[PDB]
């Protein structure tokens, strides 16, 4: 009874609309999306909501209850089960601009000497949050817990993607203790949380390899030793490990240390037949016998990612003014080689 040809996840991420996008935005959700197999939709939302808790943390081109809720109404209509995503510990600030918390409560940065180059150019290249810090849970665990609440979610995806400035030296706080715990502990605080909130958790893998050992690269994988930080963390977070250059054995990697794993794609689809294929073999493998339906248990899905704007995008995949992002492409053969995959039988 093992459907390893049916694959549970299939997941697309989207950013949220800005406002003036969100019905046409609702539309494809409703319309492309469970037609192609999108099952599973992550809102890369960041603080562009109009958050109660804290008003001032409203991203500038943000978005309120009516427009969230009515973007998950539809998203349920489509029995797309629907994730809230937001970067909780770097990528806090984007090129030269400031990502609101810091921007109000400066004082939760981890390098306040080190920032972005005016004009913008291993190099600096996002600010992170202080994870010690006392004042950021109590503030943190409300946006959040917000938008789990608004959505109805089960699940809350925290980004954990490209963290350069951990243990900086002088943080008074993190400035010289071991990186990988640092890390492995603040990933615990956001698990242990959205764990009374009945969720599950949602990170991206990139500081969990070593790009040194495996030479990935310090995008993709961790050039700053985060990696042991493997084994001091939950082994029922989900984990988006993300490759958009290469079909290379990271998911099996995390199915063998004890995680549910999503291959994580974008724009080029070269690799995501490749990496399309690679679950599919290796679900096979829980037949061979009982045993080894774990590993095969454990290889979800896959995850389609883009990361420009969804309207930019959406009047793209259609074909709108010679219209032409190989991302809102890759889409296409991907959940087309899906379908494709499990008719045949």
């Known amino acids: 009874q093992f459907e390893w040809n049916k694959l549970p996840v299939k997941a697309m991420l989207l950013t949220v609309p800005h406002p003036e996008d969100v019905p046409e935005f609702c539309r494809f959700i409703k319309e492309v999306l469970p037609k192609e197999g999108v099952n599973t939709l992550v809102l890369r939302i ?84 202080c994870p010690s810090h006392p004042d950021l849970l109590k503030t943190i665990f409300p946006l959040m817990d917000e938008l789990i609440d608004v959505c109805g979610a089960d699940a809350f995806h925290v980004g954990l993607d490209e963290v350069w400035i951990l243990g900086y030296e002088k943080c008074p706080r993190c400035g010289g203790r071991d990186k990988a715990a640092l890390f492995a502990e603040y990933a615990t605080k956001l698990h242990d949380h959205l764990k009374e909130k009945k969720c599950q958790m949602w990170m991206w893998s990139d500081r969990l390899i070593d790009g040194k050992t495996t030479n990935l690269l310090g995008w993709q994988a961790s050039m700053n030793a985060t990696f042991r930080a493997i084994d001091l963390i939950p082994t029922d977070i989900m984990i988006c490990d993300w490759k958009y250059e290469s079909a290379p054995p990271t998911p099996g990697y995390f199915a063998i240390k004890g995680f549910n794993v999503l291959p994580s794609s974008c724009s080029n689809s070269e690799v995501a037949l490749a990496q399309l294929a690679q679950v599919r073999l290796a679900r096979k493998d829980g037949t061979r016998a009982p045993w080894a339906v774990t590993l095969a248990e454990r290889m979800q899905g896959v995850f389609v990612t883009m990361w420009e704007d969804s309207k930019e995008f959406i009047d793209a995949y259609y074909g709108r003014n010679g219209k032409k992002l190989p991302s809102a492409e890759t889409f296409k053969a991907v959940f087309a080689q899906i379908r494709k995959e499990e008719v045949m039988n």
């Open 46 to 129: 960041r603080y562009n909501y109009k958050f109660k808790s804290h008003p001032e943390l409203a991203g500038e081109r943000a978005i309120s209850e009516q427009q969230l809720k009515q973007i998950v109404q539809t998203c349920k209509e489509a029995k797309i089960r629907f994730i809230p995503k937001m970067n909780l510990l770097g990528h806090q600030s984007d090129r030269d601009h400031i990502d609101p918390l810091l921007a109000k409560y400066p004082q939760f940065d981890e390098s306040p000497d080190y920032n972005p180059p005016v004009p913008w150019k291993f190099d600096f290249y996002c600010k992170s949050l």
